[PDB]
Amino acid sequence: MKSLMKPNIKRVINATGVVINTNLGRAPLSKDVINFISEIANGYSNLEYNLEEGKRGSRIAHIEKYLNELTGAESSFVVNNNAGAVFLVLNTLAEGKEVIISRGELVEIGGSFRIPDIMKKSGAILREVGTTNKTKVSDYEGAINQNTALLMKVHKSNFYMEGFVEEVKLEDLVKLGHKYGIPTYYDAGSGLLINLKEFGISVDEPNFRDCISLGIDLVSGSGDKLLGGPQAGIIVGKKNLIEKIKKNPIARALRIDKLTLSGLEMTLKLYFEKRYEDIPVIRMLTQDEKALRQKAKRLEKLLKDIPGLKISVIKDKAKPGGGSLPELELPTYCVAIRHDRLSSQELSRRLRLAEPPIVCRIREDQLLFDMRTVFHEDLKTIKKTLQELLSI
Amino acid sequence: MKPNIKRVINATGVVINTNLGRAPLSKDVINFISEIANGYSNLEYNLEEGKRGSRIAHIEKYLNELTGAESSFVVNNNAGAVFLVLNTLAEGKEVIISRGELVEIGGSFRIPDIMKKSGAILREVGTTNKTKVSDYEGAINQNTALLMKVHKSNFYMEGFVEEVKLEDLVKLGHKYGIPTYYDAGSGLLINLKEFGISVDEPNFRDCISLGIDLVSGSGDKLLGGPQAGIIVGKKNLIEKIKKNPIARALRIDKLTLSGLEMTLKLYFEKRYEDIPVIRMLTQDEKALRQKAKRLEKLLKDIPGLKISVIKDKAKPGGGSLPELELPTYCVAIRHDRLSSQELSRRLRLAEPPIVCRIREDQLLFDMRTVFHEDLKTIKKTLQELLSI
Amino acid sequence: MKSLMKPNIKRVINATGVVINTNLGRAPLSKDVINFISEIANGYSNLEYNLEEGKRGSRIAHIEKYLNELTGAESSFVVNNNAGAVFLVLNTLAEGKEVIISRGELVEIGGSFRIPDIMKKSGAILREVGTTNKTKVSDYEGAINQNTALLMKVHKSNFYMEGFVEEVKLEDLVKLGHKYGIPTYYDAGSGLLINLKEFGISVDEPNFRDCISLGIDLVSGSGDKLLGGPQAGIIVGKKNLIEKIKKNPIARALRIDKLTLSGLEMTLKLYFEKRYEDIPVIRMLTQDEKALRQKAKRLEKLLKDIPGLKISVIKDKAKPGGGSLPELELPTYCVAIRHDRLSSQELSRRLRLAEPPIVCRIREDQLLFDMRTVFHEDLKTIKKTLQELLSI
Numbered sequence A, C: 001m002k003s004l005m006k007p008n009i010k011r012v013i014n015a016t017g018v019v020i021n022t023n024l025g026r027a028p029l030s031k032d033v034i035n036f037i038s039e040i041a042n043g044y045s046n047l048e049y050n051l052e053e054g055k056r057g058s059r060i061a062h063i064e065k066y067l068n069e070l071t072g073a074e075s076s077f078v079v080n081n082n083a084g085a086v087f088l089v090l091n092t093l094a095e096g097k098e099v100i101i102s103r104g105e106l107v108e109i110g111g112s113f114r115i116p117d118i119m120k121k122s123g124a125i126l127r128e129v130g131t132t133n134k135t136k137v138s139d140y141e142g143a144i145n146q147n148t149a150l151l152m153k154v155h156k157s158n159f160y161m162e163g164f165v166e167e168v169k170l171e172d173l174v175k176l177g178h179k180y181g182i183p184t185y186y187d188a189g190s191g192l193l194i195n196l197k198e199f200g201i202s203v204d205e206p207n208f209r210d211c212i213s214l215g216i217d218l219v220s221g222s223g224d225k226l227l228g229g230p231q232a233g234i235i236v237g238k239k240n241l242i243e244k245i246k247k248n249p250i251a252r253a254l255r256i257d258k259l260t261l262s263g264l265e266m267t268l269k270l271y272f273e274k275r276y277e278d279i280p281v282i283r284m285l286t287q288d289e290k291a292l293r294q295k296a297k298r299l300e301k302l303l304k305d306i307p308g309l310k311i312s313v314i315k316d317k318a319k320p321g322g323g324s325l326p327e328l329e330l331p332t333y334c335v336a337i338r339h340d341r342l343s344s345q346e347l348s349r350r351l352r353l354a355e356p357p358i359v360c361r362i363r364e365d366q367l368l369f370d371m372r373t374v375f376h377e378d379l380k381t382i383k384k385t386l387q388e389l390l391s392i
Numbered sequence B: 001m002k003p004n005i006k007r008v009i010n011a012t013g014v015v016i017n018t019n020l021g022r023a024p025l026s027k028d029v030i031n032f033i034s035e036i037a038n039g040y041s042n043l044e045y046n047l048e049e050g051k052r053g054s055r056i057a058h059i060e061k062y063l064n065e066l067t068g069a070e071s072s073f074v075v076n077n078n079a080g081a082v083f084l085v086l087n088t089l090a091e092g093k094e095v096i097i098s099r100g101e102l103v104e105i106g107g108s109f110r111i112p113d114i115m116k117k118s119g120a121i122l123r124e125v126g127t128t129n130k131t132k133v134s135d136y137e138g139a140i141n142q143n144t145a146l147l148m149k150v151h152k153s154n155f156y157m158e159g160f161v162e163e164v165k166l167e168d169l170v171k172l173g174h175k176y177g178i179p180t181y182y183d184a185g186s187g188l189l190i191n192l193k194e195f196g197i198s199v200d201e202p203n204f205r206d207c208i209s210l211g212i213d214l215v216s217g218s219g220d221k222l223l224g225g226p227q228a229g230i231i232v233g234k235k236n237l238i239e240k241i242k243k244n245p246i247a248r249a250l251r252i253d254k255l256t257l258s259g260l261e262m263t264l265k266l267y268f269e270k271r272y273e274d275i276p277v278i279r280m281l282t283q284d285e286k287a288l289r290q291k292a293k294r295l296e297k298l299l300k301d302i303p304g305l306k307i308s309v310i311k312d313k314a315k316p317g318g319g320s321l322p323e324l325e326l327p328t329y330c331v332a333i334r335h336d337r338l339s340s341q342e343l344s345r346r347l348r349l350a351e352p353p354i355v356c357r358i359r360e361d362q363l364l365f366d367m368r369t370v371f372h373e374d375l376k377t378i379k380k381t382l383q384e385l386l387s388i
């Protein structure tokens, strides 16, 4: 009420070394993108407009061409967020009909998003198969009947399983779907655009391009995860299906705003131009082990002067991607600090309440600043923030 | 001259090994079984009265004292237990259960598959990774017969994950007048922290003192006995369960009966070092190194053999404590002429067979699961393979 | 509790002369077998493993080879007990369908096992035909219909009938089944492995090999009866059917334990090796009359010196099989004893309270020891046990 003297949203210095952070706003955007967003929003535009023909035009039009080239899909479409994509794909293709999905992929992502809950709401009929931990091909096949509208796979973005476990290979799903003439729908969630192994990160994570050339009929994902774009629900695949989807009156309630759209176009342009270093989420996961040290030591050089301050620099295995690559472990350089008068728990608590705030990881009352997620300009702001707190 | 079922030297350092026969028994238990099996017995007989008597009666007594439950029963195996609990209490009725507890343990056992064959009507709630208490309460209606919970014995989840506190389930059950059933699976009898192993693993006694109306579990896992389906809890329910005709098809044999009777005695006599599974999991890190270097001593003299001793963290419990990681001393070996993959293959086809881990062409003998008498047989076996 | 300090199951010397004794544990095992059981229990093993392939394997595998060869069936399977086999056979092949069976074969064996009761819990539907005493082929055929799934015969193991009686020849059943294309299931119950007349005991009792070569599609039986092994439900027959059965999820609830599997295998190996004398239940039923006498007078020799003891040796007709051959009447030599101070009712009572206990027959205040079921090592122990009770 009296907090209305200032906006509650503030920039925040991320030292958790966690690149995709559900809590801290997911993917940050490059300055290139943001200016472009800024430019389009400052006045009028050709949002819904064809300057060639002097008539109204589709907004999606702008984007879809990039997506089809980059992923290789026959057509594409973009809605508010992946939650909605999932929703839309189901309500559109499977209303009143059965959707076969593994008992192990019925996930909850975030607080309010639960596959079965949203699937129910869609109008779709959930046919669950296999077991929590193991699901075989026979499980999918067995549930096929006259009323089967769709074979579905969700990628477990936020958690993973270990031990006695089994999963169906996507090849097999497509094979299966082809054989019964049932469409395959893959919610990959991460919105990874192309293979990770190209940037020197070896992982199995599915990307649009590859899962499309594998013959999956529809593939969706979030824009603000491994795409490192703004928030969006990205769908790509068979033209016939996308079309039924674009037609669903619901797809108008899910229609993206001019800010995300513009931001998403530029992000795609960057990809087209192979400018990966210019989209933060990728730059951050691809950063050189030496550059992390270089940064860590650069920070330590700034903090020596501060009183009661114990400063070290460690080398550690961390899990950088939070809402995308949970199994992934990459080495990074954290800068560890300790204070005499204050427990690290109270230091951390004081740092969050600072302006601007700083969020970091703690281990055994040893305070860690993971360099992975820390920008150049933040260094200077960490020093000024620390001496103001400790030297008061 | 070879029978197909043979003693196998376990070097996998995996204590509860679903492949290699789960829990090995103590020579104390074994001889006892041997005695009861060698002639006739009072299996179903009352020597006081000179008439027929109950075969479980004694086992139940043990269990009732050790867990604290009103009554109890014992069937062929926990799959059976699960089948009988559901078939008896939930036929045509709905059983509420977490989408994250619908497990497959082994090749043949799937909660939803057996449950269906049960007659029970599966009402699945929550999500794979996160299930809340609301979820259970929500699926409660006129036809709800059971709030069920299955312990994830053979796999685990990491990351964003949620689960309902057992206490909350009991409260819930008590609130709506619905009985609660817990398939612990591992059949842990008492609290682990007693043997200096700190884990949250649920045990019969605690889960019973918590107010769970029924608890089940295998006899050949963390209880370290012979195969069995153990059920303990409210008397009125067990009564219903004993009365079901199917419980006759599930009736335990004289061997596991005797074996189980002895295993429980040891427990009553707090002799935990005399039940191998517990002894193996509680063994001293020095005793493992001691055992490791003792074996290396015997292997030096064999040709082509590179012998080292390492220190590694292993996950000892296979079908029971999947999260658990304990350190142990593996004796590592390699040969010049033969690849470790080929050497392991030749060890399996030996008499007696030897099963080991492979890590980067380094053959490993994890001492955790290896017995004293096994050392001398390994030597004799290795030299007969290599120098021949 | 106080009675907990010691186990309640104890070895017990059987002088009832009743070989298959429902109360005293049924079939005892030879030491060869027990040793083998002890060996496989003492440590780890190949239970569910393939040492050739270095991966998991079926446990049953080991056994099936033996059963298939011994009985001459295509395929076989082994569950917990014959009750379970019966339950499993029916729940697999006859759920919701009709099973035709003679009104004379609806049996209660044990206290807890009733065909019609378990068949009901089976899901199978009972179509009972004929009458108690007489049943003709006509009855069977006349009840066949669209929902007929199975023709079933249950062997009356624990009772028998005399007088005006009729029964369908197995051959005709098979012939009837082949006619309408209906499978025929025989619950032998006794699980006798080979024809008895080979050992000089002339009886009609059915065995596995003979009932299989007669074209019965499935035959089941107990392991701890006339097979002389540990407890088990043994099914043998047509592969196509065993297959369907093996795949029933319930068959995992009835999966046999490491101990009985071990014991079973050794038992069977003894059969392959044709060492019948090394399986107690066959040895005891085939014992020579002279041998029983020999044994009876060797006992009398030991007891003469005991005070107050009157000892004679008689020759009597007894009924050795309790739960398998109720008709069988065989001559045996009992050793009869009488005391002047103690009533035989009080003397038997004390003998059961001994360590080890001793259970015998009482007839008109005379105490009988039937040599059929008494081992050689038990004689000495009966001497020492008697003098301790009578002298003390």
Ligand SMILES: [K+]
Pocket: A080, A256, A257, A260
């Ligand atoms: K929006």
Ligand SMILES: [K+]
Pocket: B076, B251, B252, B253, B256, C080, C256, C257, C260
């Ligand atoms: K058993």
Ligand SMILES: [Pt+2]
Pocket: C001, C002, C003
């Ligand atoms: Pt008592």
Ligand SMILES: [Pt+2]
Pocket: C001, C002, C005
């Ligand atoms: Pt006592």
